[PDB]
């Protein structure tokens, strides 16, 4: 019944798909396929982009009855609120807001590099600064099993996505941080998540769109 | 007592400064001045970046007692929650979330253009796509005085910032949208906002950092 539209890629829909699975949500996916170089045909999407009743047509989008939502963050919060998967206390909300935006910045840093034609030259510099960024996430998490504390919330799904994808970009980046590796293991260990990663529906690749220099396939 | 730290520019602190003024908050600002080209000296900030107790040192930051916050959105939400300036119903929260992220995207589109070395070439294309962007916000707003309905909330402060700065970029951009123009008038007419705009503390310029091609001064 619920419809999740996005490109046939991991991208910004990864956290959403994982959350919908964890919450045992009833949904189907409308997958759009972008054409390859040099045209990068987006007609499949453009043909129905303005016919879905979306206020700000974009991908990903979630349709749930009269509720038509865009903006990955808004979609995650929407689903999470339906299952009590958001911060409750003032402190929990603060941590939630900070991380949501921080992770988005980290996500953009990786994306900017991966879409840069000079990807090769700029990569050494990225991996250089990566331990610094990871250290901050490691310090914030501490000995808590999840980012807001004892209870898993939506940011943990955003957290898993950016961290695990940095691990795919560079296999050894999380070595120095046991709690970050334990976090990944713990998330992938969850019943619903483990089952999903084993199913045919799991879509870990390609990481980015066909227009990417890295992660395009 | 409350401390707001940021560059001596409008940038990401505009919405926050306006919100603090509207809420009649008690605060002081720690201003950092970037050096001019070609060095763009950032030591004024870098010399104390890691001495503030911030979990993810960044600008802007807000210090409120034991509460140290980074990420403009998280700062706006923190302040808003203290003064009943957030969406309440599920529908309001959805509009709030969609707008927060959507306005951030619009903010980035303008900044990407303004920091691009090929600003002159890319400008006509931005101005071409501008009416479409503005149209969407106009349609969403409707006849409501504020973005979430009858009550003003934090997203209205984000909205004013991105809408009004596009107006500084192109004075005539809001002409075709009477409701957006009225929104701008309405916001600038609010008691606390009107008074703040007449004060010496008001900082509408420069729009971006000294590194920008447009709005650097
Ligand atoms: N900030 C938005 C970004 C949305 C976005 O850039 N979507 C890309 C794919 S990642 C797209 O192709 N959107 C379709 C369009 O703009 O027509 C979100 O987080 O959802
Ligand atoms: N997503 C962040 C972006 C923060 C950011 O880019 N801050 C720039 C000025 S706009 C800066 O100079 N940060 C200081 C630093 O990174 O050390 C926010 O919205 O607060």
Curated annotation (Swiss-Prot), chains A, B:
- Site (Important for substrate specificity) residue list: 209
Going by the record, the broad EC class of this enzyme is: transferase
Mind listing the GO molecular function terms for this protein? calcium channel inhibitor activity; enzyme binding; fatty acid binding; glutathione binding; glutathione peroxidase activity; glutathione transferase activity; protein homodimerization activity; transmembrane transporter binding
InterPro entries, per database record: Glutathione-S-Trfase_C-like (IPR010987), Glutathione-S-Trfase_C_sf (IPR036282), Glutathione_S-Trfase (IPR040079), Glutathione_S-Trfase_N (IPR004045), GST_C (IPR004046), GST_mu (IPR003081), GST_superfamily (IPR050213), Thioredoxin-like_sf (IPR036249)
A Pfam family this chain is assigned to: GST_N
Boundaries of each GST C-terminal domain copy? Answer: 89-207
- Domain GST N-terminal spans what residues? 1-87
Q: Does the keyword Phosphoprotein apply?
A: yes
Question: Where found in the cell?
Answer: Cytoplasm
What is the top-level taxon of the source organism? Eukaryota
Q: Which GO terms describe its biological process?
A: cellular detoxification of nitrogen compound; cellular response to caffeine; glutathione metabolic process; hepoxilin biosynthetic process; linoleic acid metabolic process; nitrobenzene metabolic process; regulation of cardiac muscle contraction by regulation of the release of sequestered calcium ion; regulation of release of sequestered calcium ion into cytosol by sarcoplasmic reticulum
Query: Which residues does glutathione bind?
Result: 6-7, 42-45, 49, 58-59, 71-72
Q: What is its EC number?
A: 2.5.1.18
Phosphoserine PTM positions read 26, 43
Keyword list, A-Z = Cytoplasm, Lipid metabolism, Phosphoprotein, Transferase
Binding of substrate occurs at 115
Q: In which tissues is it expressed?
A: Muscle.
The cellular component terms of Gene Ontology attached to this UniProt record, alphabetical and capped at eight, are:
cytoplasm; cytosol; extracellular exosome; intercellular bridge; sarcoplasmic reticulum
Give me the reactions it catalyses.
RX + glutathione = an S-substituted glutathione + a halide anion + H(+); 11(S)-hydroxy-14(S),15(S)-epoxy-(5Z,8Z,12E)-eicosatrienoate + glutathione = (11S,15S)-dihydroxy-14(R)-S-glutathionyl-(5Z,8Z,12E)-eicosatrienoate
The text of the family note is: Belongs to the GST superfamily. Mu family.
Q: What interactions and quaternary structure are annotated?
A: Homodimer.
- Summarize the protein's role: Conjugation of reduced glutathione to a wide number of exogenous and endogenous hydrophobic electrophiles. Participates in the formation of novel hepoxilin regioisomers.
Kindly provide the name given to this protein in its UniProt entry. Glutathione S-transferase Mu 2
What organism does the UniProt record list as the source?
A: Homo sapiens (Human)
């Amino acid at each position: 019944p619920m419809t999740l539209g996005y490109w046939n890629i991991r991208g910004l829909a990864h956290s959403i798909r994982l959350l919908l699975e964890y919450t045992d949500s009833s949904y189907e996916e409308k997958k759009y396929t972008m054409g390859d170089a040099p045209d990068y045909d987006r007609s499949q999407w453009l043909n129905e982009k303005f016919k879905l009743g979306l206020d700000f047509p974009n991908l990903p989008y979630l349709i749930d009855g009269t509720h038509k939502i865009t903006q990955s963050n808004a979609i995650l919060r929407y689903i999470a609120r339906k299952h009590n998967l958001c911060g409750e206390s003032e402190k929990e909300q603060i941590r939630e807001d900070i991380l949501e935006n921080q992770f988005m910045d980290s996500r953009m840093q990786l994306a900017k590099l991966c879409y840069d034609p000079d990807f090769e030259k700029l990569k050494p510099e990225y991996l250089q600064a990566l331990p610094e960024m990871l250290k901050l996430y490691s310090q914030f998490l501490g000995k808590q099993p999840w980012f807001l504390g004892d209870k898993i919330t939506f940011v943990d799904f955003i957290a898993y996505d950016v961290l695990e994808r940095n691990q795919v970009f560079e296999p050894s980046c999380l070595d120095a941080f046991p709690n970050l590796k334990d976090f990944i293991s713990r998330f992938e260990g969850l019943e619903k998540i483990s089952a999903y990663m084993k199913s045919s529906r799991f879509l870990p690749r390609p990481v980015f769109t066909k227009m990417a220099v890295w992660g395009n396939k």
